DNA sequence: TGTCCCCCGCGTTTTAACCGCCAAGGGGATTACTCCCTAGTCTCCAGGCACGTGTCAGATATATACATCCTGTTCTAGAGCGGCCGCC
DNA sequence: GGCGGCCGCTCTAGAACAGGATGTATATATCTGACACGTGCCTGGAGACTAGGGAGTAATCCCCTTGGCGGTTAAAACGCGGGGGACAGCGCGTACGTGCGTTTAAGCGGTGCTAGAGCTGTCTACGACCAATTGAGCGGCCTCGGCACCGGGATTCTCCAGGG
């Protein structure tokens, strides 16, 4: 189909056109069109968005509170996001999600875990919290093991993380209905945490 | 039998001109050459038809064609 | 009735023409194909008399005579072309050659 | 001298050509029986040819007269120049 | 107060048009020279006859061209790139159109003479024709070898790119 479809420089392909039969080659390498290499280099140089107002008091309460206490005083924190992320597949996915595939919850949970795996160092880092992360990386470098933040970080910063993702969501070229779905599951998250006030 | 004047193809006339030592061959020479060949055939074949009708024969021999070429000063040898 | 309807060789013109002139001038075989000329002969003959046949040798003699006559006419046409300070032949040169020949 | 469009050299895909092969059935080629008109005379006579001659259309002759071609004069259209007018 | 734009004025030239020029188109006057009619033949075709032979026609036969296929690779045909050449155009020029001066031979008319083509005999070898014969030309068969075909290799002339 069409009139111009060639992996090499196009010669109105619909094999090297305009040449004899003793020049064919069908080996496999990388392919680039480049418009016949800029038309043989111009013929050899001419022949040479915000969260809804439902439970917004939490970040107001925690903005003043992290100035001197930072919401945590024990480095091996007993609160981990692993169980509260695992409970989503057993509590809200079996009740609120429409019958079908739970990919929109499980895949998003795995993506949130992957984002939390490397989100440290660039964002969500108060100054003394940065010092605490520095001392955690110092004490975790004595056995040349990777720093895994699933066992030393609480779930209290997850609310701030879903507060600070939407303005960097629109920082890249992205379709609007993906952001609509993002804010939809953010609304689902705040619906789930509306009555579960003990863990946060 | 129709459109038999196009049986003498364009590269056939080109090769005939190449035998005559013609350097360049125009695109309008083919119709004129076909017309000249048609006139020459309409003379020679008609003369051979008269020769065959004279001899009470139904098919025309090569000898009658030789006679028809000879009577117009274009005698042919080998037949 | 019931129907609704890298660099190529790139030979310049003239050299290959002279090559073909040298190849066919020293050649012997017939340039015109057999059956198209035979069919043209039958089509011309059917206007004068129907139910007429031509033998193979009569068609051969007609083809060789026509080839020789057209070769001589093309030689005269090319001679008139060089005579007219040209290398390309024109149909008016063919008409002039026919007028000079008296046919 | 230019130019551009007309033709040539070559890639590609159809396209019919030539040999391979098979019968056919009008048709060239050969042989014979017969029959008309052409080879060859006899005679003549009416159409064809040599000679004589009145004659009727062609050529010479010349003023008159065509007849178109060459050239001079004028008509009208086109470009250049200069005077007048409005604007910044 | 200076300058661009606009319109009128004069200069210049293409071209339609009318008048002069010279070689033919005609209108008689008259010569004139073959044109065709008449006459007198007379020489070739037609009526009629004899005889025969080559084609008209019938039959056979065997032969050879037309139709009619697949196959397959040579090539016609379509189209792209492009490339050199036909022709419009412009300029240089010379050499051929036009015109009479002057010479010079073409032709009309005349005279003499023989070079020789018809014309008429004459006599003589010569070729068609008839017996009689006969010997290699040609259809056909056996043999055989020269170049078409198929590749292999190669000099060899031709185009593209680099250097001065």
């Amino acid at each position: 189909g069409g009139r111009c479809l060639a992996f090499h420089g196009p010669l109105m392909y619909e094999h090297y056109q305009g040449w004899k039969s003793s020049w064919d080659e069908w080996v496999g390498y990388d392919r680039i069109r480049a418009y016949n290499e800029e038309n043989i280099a111009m013929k050899k140089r001419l022949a040479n968005l915000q969260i809804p107002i439902k439970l917004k008091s939490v970040l107001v309460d925690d903005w003043e509170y992290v100035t001197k206490d930072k919401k945590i005083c024990r480095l091996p924190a007993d609160v981990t996001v692993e169980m509260v992320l695992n409970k989503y597949e057993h509590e809200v996915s079996q009740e609120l999600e429409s019958p079908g595939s739970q990919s929109q919850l499980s895949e998003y949970c795995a993506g949130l875990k992957l984002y939390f795996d490397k989100c440290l160092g660039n964002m969500l880092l108060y100054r003394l919290e940065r010092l605490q992360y520095d001392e955690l990386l110092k004490k975790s470098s004595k056995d040349q093991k990777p720093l895994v933040p699933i066992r030393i970080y609480g779930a209290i910063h997850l609310l701030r993380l879903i507060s600070v993702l939407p303005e960097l969501i629109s920082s890249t070229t992205m379709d609007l209905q993906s952001c609509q779905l993002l804010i939809k599951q953010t609304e689902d998250f705040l619906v789930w945490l509306l009555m579960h006030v003990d863990e946060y | 039998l129709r459109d038999n004047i196009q049986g003498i193809t364009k590269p056939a006339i080109r090769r005939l001109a190449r035998r005559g030592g013609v350097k360049r061959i125009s695109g309008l020479i083919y119709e004129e050459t076909r017309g000249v060949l048609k006139v020459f055939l309409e003379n020679v074949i008609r003369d051979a038809v008269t020769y065959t009708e004279h001899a009470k024969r139904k098919t025309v021999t090569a000898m009658d064609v030789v006679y028809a070429l000879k009577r117009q000063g274009r005698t042919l040898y080998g037949f | 009735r019931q129907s609704t309807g890298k660099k190529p060789h790139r030979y310049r013109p003239g050299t290959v023409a002279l090559r073909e002139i040298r190849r066919y001038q020293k050649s012997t075989e017939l340039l015109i194909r057999k059956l198209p000329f035979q069919r043209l002969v039958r089509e011309i003959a059917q206007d004068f008399k129907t139910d007429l046949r031509f033998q193979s040798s009569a068609v051969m003699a007609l083809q060789e005579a026509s080839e020789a006559y057209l070769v001589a006419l093309f030689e005269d046409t090319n001679l008139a072309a060089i005579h007219a300070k040209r290398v390309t032949i024109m149909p008016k040169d063919i008409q002039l050659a026919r007028r000079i020949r008296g046919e």
Side-chain angles (χ1 to χ4, degrees):
Chain A
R3 79 258 197 274
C4 172
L5 213 79
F7 78 115
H8 73 304
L11 292 173
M12 308 222 99
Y13 196 87
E14 280 188 17
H15 176 85
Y16 301 96
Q17 307 305 310
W19 291 92
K20 306 246 220 154
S21 64
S22 64
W23 265 300
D24 248 13
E25 191 86 9
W26 264 304
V27 289
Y29 36 60
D30 72 318
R31 59 107 162 210
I32 294 169
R33 205 248 309 263
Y35 295 93
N36 215 294
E37 291 180 350
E38 218 184 20
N39 303 335
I40 196 52
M42 71 216 156
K43 294 179 179 179
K44 316 199 182 92
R45 286 231 272 142
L46 205 66
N48 196 30
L49 255 77
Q50 61 185 356
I51 39 173
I53 314 170
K54 190 64 69 67
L55 210 46
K56 216 182 309 304
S57 296
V58 47
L59 44 60
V60 188
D61 180 285
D62 250 341
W63 202 92
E64 187 40 62
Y65 194 80
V66 295
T67 55
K68 293 179 179 179
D69 180 270
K70 288 142 306 182
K71 208 31 154 193
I72 181 70
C73 80
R74 296 114 36 187
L75 268 82
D78 277 300
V79 179
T80 48
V81 72
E82 166 110 5
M83 290 81 96
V84 77
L85 275 176
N86 158 25
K87 278 187 282 186
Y88 293 160
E89 279 93 306
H90 296 286
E91 179 180 1
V92 57
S93 79
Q94 316 301 285
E95 179 183 1
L96 279 186
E97 172 248 358
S98 294
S101 80
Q102 313 66 348
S103 270
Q104 55 255 8
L105 177 63
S106 176
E107 203 313 325
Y108 156 85
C109 281
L112 201 55
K113 288 212 303 215
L114 282 194
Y115 210 32
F116 225 115
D117 281 332
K118 84 287 190 175
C119 73
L120 304 320
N122 311 120
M123 206 183 209
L124 287 87
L125 18 78
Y126 168 87
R127 294 326 287 199
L128 285 282
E129 265 288 319
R130 168 70 173 173
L131 184 65
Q132 186 175 359
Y133 184 73
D134 213 271
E135 88 211 349
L136 272 159
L137 196 60
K138 175 66 185 296
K139 74 169 56 52
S140 177
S141 297
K142 64 164 66 72
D143 45 348
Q144 64 114 32
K145 294 294 182 182
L147 176 286
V148 183
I150 195 75
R151 298 281 187 275
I152 51 167
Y153 215 85
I156 184 51
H157 290 69
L158 200 65
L159 301 125
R160 145 152 164 200
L161 169 64
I162 47 158
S163 181
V164 287
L165 92 179
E167 64 297 28
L168 58 102
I169 271 175
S170 292
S171 181
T172 182
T173 57
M174 210 181 193
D175 68 85
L176 85 171
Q177 66 147 11
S178 65
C179 323
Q180 152 164 338
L181 165 145
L182 259 282
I183 217 80
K184 262 304 297 193
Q185 41 80 353
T186 315
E187 282 182 0
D188 163 58
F189 196 170
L190 57 74
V191 154
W192 177 112
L193 72 99
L194 155 81
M195 38 99 69
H196 219 174
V197 294
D198 230 16
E199 285 284 323
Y200 306 109
Chain B
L1 294 172
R2 257 85 180 173
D3 209 71
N4 289 337
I5 199 44
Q6 225 66 351
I8 302 332
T9 51
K10 169 246 181 63
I13 311 187
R14 146 173 321 293
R15 282 184 315 230
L16 267 190
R18 287 294 169 255
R19 190 161 276 180
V22 169
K23 188 68 175 323
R24 292 223 329 171
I25 294 149
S26 180
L28 309 143
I29 218 77
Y30 310 112
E31 269 324 300
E32 187 75 27
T33 317
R34 280 181 190 107
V36 166
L37 181 54
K38 181 101 154 263
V39 166
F40 179 72
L41 282 177
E42 271 170 350
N43 299 358
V44 171
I45 297 169
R46 159 173 74 241
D47 285 332
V49 154
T50 57
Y51 265 114
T52 319
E53 282 165 349
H54 187 69
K56 298 280 168 102
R57 276 187 352 258
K58 267 318 145 172
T59 195
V60 63
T61 68
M63 254 299 137
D64 302 358
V65 180
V66 161
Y67 298 146
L69 291 151
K70 181 229 308 171
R71 56 159 283 97
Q72 46 198 257
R74 235 185 290 278
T75 89
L76 168 62
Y77 291 163
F79 289 93
Chain C
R1 193 158 296 209
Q2 260 179 12
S3 155
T4 53
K6 323 178 66 181
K7 176 80 195 113
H9 216 81
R10 284 305 308 167
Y11 266 143
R12 42 251 292 282
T15 85
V16 179
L18 281 166
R19 169 187 296 150
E20 271 173 11
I21 283 168
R22 291 192 300 271
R23 144 183 163 91
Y24 289 129
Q25 262 178 345
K26 77 171 75 168
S27 91
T28 279
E29 92 273 35
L30 272 194
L31 309 171
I32 301 182
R33 317 288 251 158
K34 265 48 160 301
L35 330 172
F37 195 87
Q38 191 174 183
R39 281 179 331 230
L40 177 58
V41 157
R42 304 268 157 78
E43 188 221 20
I44 285 160
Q46 93 191 0
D47 296 301
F48 303 135
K49 141 172 271 283
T50 62
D51 292 331
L52 194 78
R53 339 212 303 180
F54 286 70
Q55 64 180 20
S56 52
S57 147
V59 164
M60 282 336 317
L62 264 156
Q63 181 151 355
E64 304 243 359
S66 325
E67 276 210 359
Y69 164 69
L70 281 176
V71 152
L73 181 77
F74 268 131
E75 280 174 351
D76 297 334
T77 305
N78 203 35
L79 248 58
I82 298 130
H83 158 263
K85 316 294 217 193
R86 283 189 278 101
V87 310
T88 299
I89 53 168
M90 320 288 159
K92 54 171 246 159
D93 289 345
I94 281 188
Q95 284 140 230
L96 155 81
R98 292 264 321 281
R99 150 88 189 82
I100 291 180
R101 275 181 175 184
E103 42 211 63

